[PDB]
Amino acid sequence: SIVIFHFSWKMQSDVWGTVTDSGVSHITGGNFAQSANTINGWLRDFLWAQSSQVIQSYGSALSAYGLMFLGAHF
Amino acid sequence: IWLSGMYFHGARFSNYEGWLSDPTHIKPSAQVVWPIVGQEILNGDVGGGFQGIQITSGFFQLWRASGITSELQL
Amino acid sequence: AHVVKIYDTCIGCTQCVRACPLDVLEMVPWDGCKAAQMASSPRTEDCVGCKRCETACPTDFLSVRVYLGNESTRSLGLAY
Amino acid sequence: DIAGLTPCSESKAYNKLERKELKVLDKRLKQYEPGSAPYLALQATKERTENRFKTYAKQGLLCGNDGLPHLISDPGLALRFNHAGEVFITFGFLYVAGYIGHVGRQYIILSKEDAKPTDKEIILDVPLALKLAFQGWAWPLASIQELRNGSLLEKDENITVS
Amino acid sequence: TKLFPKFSQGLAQDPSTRRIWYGLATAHDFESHDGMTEENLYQKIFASHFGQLAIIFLWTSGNLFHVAWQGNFEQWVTDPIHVRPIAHAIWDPHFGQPAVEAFTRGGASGPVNIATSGVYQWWYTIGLRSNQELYVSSVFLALVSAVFLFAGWLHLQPNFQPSLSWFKDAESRLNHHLAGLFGVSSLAWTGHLVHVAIPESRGQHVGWDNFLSVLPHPQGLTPFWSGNWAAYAQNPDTASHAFGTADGSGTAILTFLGGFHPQTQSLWLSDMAHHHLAIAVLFIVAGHMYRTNFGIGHRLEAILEAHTPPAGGLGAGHKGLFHTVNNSLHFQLGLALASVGTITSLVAQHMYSLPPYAYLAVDFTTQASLYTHHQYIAGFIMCGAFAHGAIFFIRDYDPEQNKGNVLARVLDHKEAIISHLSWVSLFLGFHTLGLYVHNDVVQAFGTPEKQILIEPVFAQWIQAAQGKSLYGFDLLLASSSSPAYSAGQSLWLPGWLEAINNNQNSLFLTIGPGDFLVHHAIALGLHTTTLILVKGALDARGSKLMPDKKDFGYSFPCDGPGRGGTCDISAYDAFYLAVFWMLNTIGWVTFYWHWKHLTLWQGNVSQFDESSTYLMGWLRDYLWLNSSQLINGYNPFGMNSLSVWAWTFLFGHLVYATGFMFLISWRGYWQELIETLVWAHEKTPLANLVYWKDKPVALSIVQARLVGLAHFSVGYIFTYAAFLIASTAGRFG
Amino acid sequence: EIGPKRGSLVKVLRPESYWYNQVGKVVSVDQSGIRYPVVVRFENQNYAGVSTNNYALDEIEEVK
Amino acid sequence: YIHNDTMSALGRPQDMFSDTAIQLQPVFAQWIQNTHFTAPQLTAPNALAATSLTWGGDVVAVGGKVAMMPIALG
Amino acid sequence: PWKQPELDPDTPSPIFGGSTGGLLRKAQVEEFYVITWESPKEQIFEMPTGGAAIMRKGPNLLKFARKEQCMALTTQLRSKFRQTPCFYRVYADGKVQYLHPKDGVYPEKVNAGRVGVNQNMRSIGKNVDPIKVKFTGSAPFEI
Ligand code: CLA
Ligand code: CLA
Ligand code: CLA
Ligand code: CLA
Ligand code: CLA
Ligand SMILES: CC1=C(/C=C/C(C)=C/C=C/C(C)=C/C=C/C=C(C)/C=C/C=C(C)/C=C/C2=C(C)CCCC2(C)C)C(C)(C)CCC1
Ligand SMILES: CC1=C(C/C=C(\C)CCC[C@H](C)CCC[C@H](C)CCCC(C)C)C(=O)c2ccccc2C1=O
Ligand SMILES: CCCCCCCCCCCCCCCCCC=O
Ligand code: SF4
Ligand code: SF4
Ligand code: SF4
Ligand SMILES: [Ca+2]
């Protein structure tokens, strides 16, 4: 679980994103180096900062992921 | 049997032909849900005049790598 | 150590003496069953408490009981 | 108009919500051709939404302060007004539940009167189960007639430690 | 042979670490100590009681001292709405530059922490107004604590130790506890309310230097000895009346006004005096019921023997119950814990609805912390009551003494009782979970109208029967022609109706379809915890899988892996399993309370009412939305006052996760691991010089369950306390 | 001769047995003066797995 | 991690294991990344470039989105 | 047996490489056990402390730290090679104690030469309750 968490956050904060004429902008704010040193950084900038899509997923096309999210917790 | 099922689903219930002409704008999809209790919302608009469950298996990219144009080959 | 007891509802099948892995129980002669033998436990200080005798007991309820108590170096199974 | 609620026929929140859903579904109609399969699917979903709102309303169902229909469950309070249908008809579940219980109890008693009733549990006796399933339509009559005769319980033949 | 477990030679002769751990576990089980008689047992209990009283008074004395030294009590009295209470000062050499700058709040010169105990409002309400009165009262409480400690030692001496019959005397104990401890103390409290609390609330300073020269009422006892008792309720305090000065004050003392105070939002101080006075008269007149050494009174044994219905409804009735209760200590302990655990919850339910302290409804963190604290305390005490009932059934229940009575009669159908509890729990669980999942799926398919919403027509009917005219039920106390409305129409009904009709306080909050499901969830948790505890108490002395369980004690590991396996078969194990359900039930009731008040305090009462039906709405609008400021205590851009709460919020998570280790992993794996470490330390150079005095061994099975439960409960408590105080303190006052 | 008829179903009266108030078939009754000579056999197995046990003469009652 | 948590909570961000404060750099992996990047010039002459763009310096992007960008280690 | 065979030294111990699980500081400070048996041929057995060892012909003697290890090796030799072993308990001072078989026949036989101990002539379930044995230090089963 820690291995896949490290992969997802590192890719989203240092590789993936979109390139424009004035540089490349990552998916997140590029906060892998300044927020991974603390445990509160993970719980705040990874699990809480992300998962907002899973949380606000009701009524959308990916509505089954919120149901799968709550169901998996049970 | 599972591999044949994935090929048959990509042949009949997918949008591989639409994704083949626009791989950078249409999202992959190879599963359509029947409208029983609600459930129309899951059939998300994936683009290309088709609506279904967006798949993340990479079967379309694999079918692109070894030449496969129509659905008759699938 | 632990306290082992053998009640009179014993049938003398000699299964607890075979299941004991520390040579605690024995079979003494008796005159109250068909086999004319009843179990006993002279080496109670060597009881470890694995309760294999209770699983080997076939009568209902068990004729042998292992009541756990104080622990010593022998009853704790320590090899150091 | 009881418990401080109001009929779904005269609530602004009910109509506001109806228009909200009809609008979010209509926003997806512009992304497709006016005569294809996604267009037909979206049109069918819109018709079902309009029918459901009409069906949910004008049927005595009432909502409260948010347009969501509320349900009255007290008998008497649901009988003095036209609200008996929403939840007081518990007899449907009671009928199906008693049907299941009577069929299972009849299969357990009849199968026990046979040598070794165990393998009859892992390997069902399908002609006996199908016959017992279609014979329990009048289950409350059999339950009241099996209670007065004392053939429903046991006196004192139970594995107890009390 | 060591000498640390002085009370047990068996553990004293243990050559392992098990002697140390167990030496701290059975230290209070006086009933199973080496060479202990009934008289010695009762005398030891009488001493430990005094020790507990001494530490309680010392703790409250220390609280008064700390608030008088660092708290801004004098600054809080002049402005009880804007300023925040101060608990104590913070001295930490580990603090940095920004921690010292950010921890200074409440108008202080150094770093301090705001108090959530709510003692400032309590002291300001009872009459304490200076920073010196807390000082002198703190030294007085320390003095009375010292006296209790001396009294406990005094009674542990020859020619001063009480006998066994003195302990086994219920008539005089009940007479003195109902007359002196419950009645005289209440009479003294209403005397303080009428002599100090009432004049201090009207600006008239009354202290030890002038209370003998200021009369509480103008009439001055003249009506108490005359047929004019209503003179003490002539002019009550008007609406436009400040709680600090005499602007709009009155001269009445024993009034009867329903509702609250217009400025402090608390009950009238001239009503609590009347309340405590009526309670004092009732308790004093009730304390002369039993027969002491006189020619009047009642006999408890005679009442119990006379209470037996004819036609064999209960068989022997209550015959032998007097000797069963008086001869046993766990029965009395279970009854006392049940009563205390019930009234603790009663205190929690009445303090939030009817605030008794001035400016308590304004303090939002104090109310939440006080409610959560009292509810968790009540849950733990309620679990202890059933635990001691199981201990009673195993240790001191002789079946030959009370044959055929109600105690032996309820034991005959324990299977019926346990089975019906199982049915109720299964019903509530299946249906509450099904309704929640149905509303959740229907809400997830983009259709909220489809979700099932049940209006609580029974609790709404009760609220309409008590005065709330929002639902529309034309019933008594809400009508104008009912006999209950005309009765009391001139006594307390206008103030009570004015307080219950307002939608801003917490007195009888407006319920809806979202409270129905949560109330059913609360019912499910209560019936399940009761099922586990009642089953562990009734099946404590035997079962069909193990009939001689009563001969094995109360807390044993198992009875081997035979007969299918007997893991967690003792009553201790049953209580252990019930602690988790108690924690879950209290967590559900506190989540409900905090969310309803969290949505009422911010004027967004329509948020919870429409978003509390589905569990995703609970997880999003309650756990995810209210946790935005808590986790932002310390980020790479600095820190703030909430950082300490943010730290303990994660500290609780770590304690919880460590408890899961002792709960999942069992002793045998760890025993082999410890053996390998022993070989390592013995065959290693330069470290083999030292050696352990006691052989290292793994924790026992029962000990592992206890440590895991302690880690689980500590994490569960610390995490929620951090989130509650941070989420409330972070966005409110 | 002293015990019940061999092959007759009886009821167990031992209050601490797994077959209390149950019905078991008597397989044999010993005639040597032992404490528990009536040996019975039950259709349902106990928690240990056995299906037969021997009871005394006083803890054996006729079925219903 | 717990030390960085306590150092950030106590208001002392200069005493934590981070890139700004007291650091720990993975010099072995940084050297291997450099070796793989400059490897097709001396120890792989027939190879056109590095076997991957994980340690390179040329970010590739298809459709505006980043495909494989160089990865840095801290 | 007919006489307690006194344990004697200078017995050929089995060939075995150095193991790791055995004879710690307790085997010297407190006590340890020793098992002797007679082998009729040359075989390879499994020690209850690690790998496998061979069986030297003639007498055989092994030393262990726990009685359970000697009992485990005893049952292994009795059920896999049909032998008749016997073990002793050596105390710290050097006092040898015969341990198995004490009567010398086997512990699962009768032999009519041993008196029963720790037996209750009552059946389990007829024991009195915890309340009756209060402050008596004794227990229902002990009574
Ligand atoms: C008008 C005739 C009358 C009636 C109706 C009663 C009625 C009663 N008498 Mg009384 N009595 C009468 C005449 C009468 N008496 C006369 C003429 C005399 C002689 C003077 C007495 C003398 C007498 C004595 C001395 C006593 C009674 C008692 C009682 C009460 C209990 C009787 C009983 O068997 O318990 C009920 C039978 C049971 C089997 C109890 C059932 C328990 C249930 C099933 C538990 C279910 C709980 C479950 C969790 C519920 C869920 C609800 C949820 C909210 C939790 C009962 C209400 C006894 C009493 O005072 O008790 C209060 C008592 O000791 N009577
Ligand atoms: C048809 C068989 C049958 C019948 C008549 C009953 C009847 C009863 N059960 Mg029960 N039960 C059953 C099967 C059955 N059960 C099975 C298979 C299980 C294991 C999952 C349980 C587990 C169970 C528990 C844990 C409890 C009960 C309880 C009860 C009593 C309360 C009412 C209730 O509905 O509880 C609920 C019943 C269930 C949740 C079981 C539902 C599962 C289905 C209906 C069983 C499938 C039966 C099968 C289709 C029959 C075969 C048909 C045949 C033609 C082949 C009641 C007398 C409660 C009690 O103690 O008494 C007060 C209780 O706590 N039951
Ligand atoms: C009238 C004489 C008298 C008085 C005043 C007392 C007083 C006391 N006895 Mg005693 N006793 C007496 C006679 C008396 N006894 C006699 C004559 C006998 C012999 C027959 C005994 C035998 C006896 C024994 C054996 C024991 C006591 C004990 C105690 C102490 C009880 C513990 C306690 O403080 O709880 C305080 C109780 C209250 C304050 C009232 C109850 C509180 C309820 C729950 C309501 C809460 C009030 C309110 C809501 C909260 C407001 C506070 C909040 C604002 C902070 C107490 C100080 C126990 C002891 O040793 O000390 C612990 C004990 O073991 N007594
Ligand atoms: C009026 C209150 C009261 C009293 C007088 C007793 C008295 C007794 N209890 Mg009891 N009990 C109570 C309430 C009470 N209990 C409650 C509320 C519960 C529910 C939690 C229990 C549950 C309970 C059980 C399950 C058992 C007893 C047992 C006993 C008996 C001996 C064990 C003992 O006390 O040694 C002292 C025990 C200890 C010193 C252990 C202390 C470790 C605590 C629990 C952990 C502290 C948490 C943590 C470290 C806090 C630090 C946080 C950190 C961040 C700083 C004894 C007669 C035992 C018994 O009957 O004997 C077999 C038994 O097994 N009690
Ligand atoms: C135990 C909790 C629970 C309950 C009470 C409900 C209840 C309901 N759900 Mg729900 N649901 C649940 C759990 C639950 N659900 C869970 C856990 C999930 C997630 C898997 C869902 C997911 C879900 C979805 C997706 C939907 C529902 C829907 C519904 C509604 C369907 C009504 C219906 O089935 O038509 C009628 C069914 C019948 C008539 C069955 C016929 C049975 C026989 C043939 C007839 C009975 C005999 C008859 C009455 C004659 C008897 C005579 C008598 C008078 C004597 C209903 C109010 C649907 C809805 O419309 O929402 C409102 C729907 O969309 N549910
Ligand atoms: C195990 C056991 C035990 C314990 C037990 C317990 C724990 C119990 C409990 C319980 C509980 C915890 C209970 C509770 C209760 C309460 C109640 C039951 C109540 C009441 C009342 C009423 C009836 C009321 C009424 C009213 C009024 C008067 C006013 C207002 C209105 C109303 C209606 C509300 C012991 C030790 C003994 C031993 C035996 C066994
Ligand atoms: C790790 C582990 C051990 C080993 C744990 C040990 C040996 C604990 C001792 C390690 C140190 C000494 C603990 C530190 C002690 C505390 C910090 C303070 C305790 C002091 C209080 C009594 C005041 C077990 O013995 C065990 C037993 C049964 C199930 C699971 C487990 C288990 O998981
Ligand atoms: C599982 C038993 C059947 C196995 C053989 C399946 C034969 C299927 C052959 C392909 C059938 C395709 C039919 C598609 C019809 C619609 C064409 C439009 O795309
Ligand atoms: S518990 Fe184990 S060591 Fe003790 S007598 Fe039974 S089998 Fe032997
Ligand atoms: S196993 Fe039980 S019945 Fe058999 S000899 Fe041992 S104690 Fe007796
Ligand atoms: S608690 Fe441990 S020893 Fe006891 S039965 Fe369970 S697994 Fe076996
Ligand atoms: Ca003052």
- Please report all neighbours of D, defined by 3+ CB atom pairs within 8 A: B, E, F
Helical residues (DSSP H) of E354-413, grouped into ranges: 364-395, 406-409
Beta strand F38-41 with F52-55 is: antiparallel
Tokens of E459: 């609790």
Chain D contact set for F22 (CB, 8 A):
157, 159
Burial class (CB in 10 A: 0-12, 13-18, 19+), B44: buried
Number of domains, chain D: 1
Q: How far apart are the C-alpha atoms of E559 and E212, rounded to whole Å?
A: 71
Question: Could you tell me where the beta strands, DSSP code E, fall in chain C?
Answer: 3-7, 26-29, 37-40, 64-67
The SS3 of residue E381 is helix
CA distance E446 to chain A (A): 4
Task: Indicate which atom in ligand 3 lies nearest the CA of residue E122.
Answer: 54
Q: State the method.
A: cryo-EM
State the Rg of chain E over Cα.
29
Backbone angles phi and psi of H104, in degrees to 5? 90, -5
The sign one gets for the Cα dihedral E465, E469, E473, E479 is: positive
Give the residue from E657, E641, E665 showing the smallest Cα distance to E718: E657
Contact partners, residue B2, CB within 8 Å, separation at least 6: none
Cβ atoms of H23 and H69 closer than 8 Å: no
Distance (Å, whole) CA E438 – CA E613: 10
**C-alpha atoms less than 13 angstroms from C-alpha of D42 in its C-beta half-sphere:** 25
Cα E244 to Cα G5: distance, rounded to the nearest angstrom: 46
CA distance between the termini of chain C: 18
Do the strands C3-7 and C37-40 form a parallel or antiparallel pair, or are they unpaired?
Answer: unpaired
- Would you say the CB of residue E565 lies under 6 angstroms from ligand 11? yes
Tokens of G49: 């470039």
Residue H127 per-residue DSSP state: P
- Tally the residues of chain H: 143
Write the residue in C8, C21, C25 that is nearest to H120 by C-beta.
Answer: C8
Provide the 8-state DSSP code for A47: I
G51-71 burial: b if 16+ Cβ within 10 Å, else e: eebebbeeeeeeeeebebbbe
Which DSSP string corresponds to D99-126? Answer: HHHHHHHHHHHHHHSSSSTTHHHHS--H
Q: Residue E426 is encoded by which pair of tokens?
A: 């299964």
Half-sphere exposure of G56 (CA within 13 A, CB side): 15
Residue A70 corresponds to which tokens in the numbers above?
């709550």
Which stretches does DSSP call E strand in H47-102? 52-54, 58-64, 86-91, 96-100
Kind plus residue range of the DSSP H or E element containing E426: helix E414-444
Q: Packing angle between helix E571-601 and helix E513-538, nearest 10 degrees?
A: 160
- Asked if C77 and H24 come within 8 Å (Cβ–Cβ), the reply is no
For F38, other C-beta atoms within 10 Å of its C-beta total 24
Do the Cβ atoms of E270 and E258 come closer than 8 Å? no
User: What domains does chain F contain, in order, with CATH numbers?
Assistant: 1-64 (2.30.30.50)
Q: What chain F residue is nearest to E547 in terms of C-alpha separation? A: F16
CA distance D158 to E547: 16
Distance (Å, whole) CA E568 – CA E580: 15
> Kind of pairing, strands H119-120 and C3-7?
parallel
* Cβ pair B16, B42 in contact under 8 A: no
Q: Which ranges in E242-299 belong to alpha helices (H)? A: 269-286
User: What span, in angstroms and rounded, lies between the C-alpha atoms of E355 and E368?
Assistant: 12
Q: Rounded to whole angstroms, how far apart are CA atoms G46 and G62?
A: 27
Number of other CB atoms surrounding residue H7 within 10 Å: 18
B30, B24, B23: which is closest to B7 by C-alpha? B30
Sheet (strand H31-39) strand order: H58-64, H31-39, H86-91, H96-100
Residue carrying structure tokens 């009292």:
E374
Q: Exposed e or buried b for every residue in D39-71, given b needs 16+ CB within 10 A?
A: bebbeebbebbeeebeebbeeebbbbebbbbbb
Angle subtended at Cα H54 by Cα H51 and Cα H55, rounded to the nearest 5 degrees: 135
Contact between D16 and D67 under an 8 Å Cβ cutoff? The reply is: yes
Any residues with CB less than 8 A from the CB of E559 and at least 6 apart, and which? C51, C54, E546, E552, E566, E569
CATH number at residue E602: 1.20.1130.10
User: Using an 8 Å Cβ cutoff, are H14 and H57 in contact?
Assistant: no
Contact E499, E505 (CB under 8 A): yes
Count how many domains chain E has.
Answer: 1
Amino acid residing at E715: G
Q: Which atom of ligand 6 approaches the CA of E390 most closely?
A: 1
Q: How far apart are CA E586 and CA E378, in angstroms?
A: 9
Sign for the pseudo-dihedral over CA of H73, H79, H84, H86: positive
CB atoms within 10 A of CB H23: 14
Residue count of chain F, please give it: 64
Query: How far are the Cα atoms of C63, D105, D150, E725 from residue D111, in angstroms, in the given order?
Result: 37, 10, 20, 62
CATH number, position D21: 1.10.8.110
Report the topology of domain H1-143.
Photosystem 1 Reaction Centre Subunit Ii; Chain: D; (3.30.1470)
DSSP labels, B10-37:
HHHSS-HHHHHT-TTTSPP-------SS
Q: Which domain holds residue D64?
A: 1-162
Instruction: Say whether G5 and A14 touch across the interface (CB within 8 A).
Output: no
Residues 6+ apart with CB under 8 A from E337: E381, E382, E384, E385, E388
HSE at residue E70, side-chain half, CA atoms within 13 A, is: 20
Query: How are strands ordered across the β-sheet holding A23-26?
Result: A23-26, A17-20, G65-68, G60-62
| Axis crossing angle, helix E701-731 with helix E364-395, rounded to the nearest 10 | 160
Cβ(E592)–Cβ(E522) under 8 Å?
yes
Tokens of E515: 């409270």
State the nearest Cα–Cα gap between E632 and chain G, in angstroms. Answer: 11
Q: Which domain holds residue E245?
A: 1-733
Domains of chain C: 1-80 (3.30.70.20)
Nearest CB to C61 within list H107, H117, H125: H125
The sign one gets for the Cα dihedral E575, E580, E583, E588 is negative
Residue for token digits 């086999």? Answer: C35
Of H59, H67, H104, H61, whose CA–CA distance to H89 is shortest? H67
Between CA B68 and CA B73, with CA B70 as vertex, the angle to 5 degrees is 65
Closest C-alpha to F28, from F12, F40, F44: F40
What residues of E are designated binding site?
28, 49, 52, 59, 66, 70, 88, 91-92, 94, 116-117, 122, 133, 155, 166, 172-173, 175-177, 189, 192, 195, 200, 208, 229, 274-276, 288, 292, 297-298, 307, 318, 349-350, 357, 373-374, 388, 409, 413, 420, 423, 431, 438, 450, 458-459, 463, 466, 492, 500, 502, 507, 519-520, 527, 558, 567, 581, 653, 656, 661, 669-670, 699, 711
Mark whether H and B touch (3+ CB pairs within 8 Å). no
Round to whole Å and give the CA distance between H118 and H121: 10
Euclidean distance between CA atoms E168 and E166, whole angstroms: 5
- Measured from the Cα of D104, ligand 2's closest atom is 1
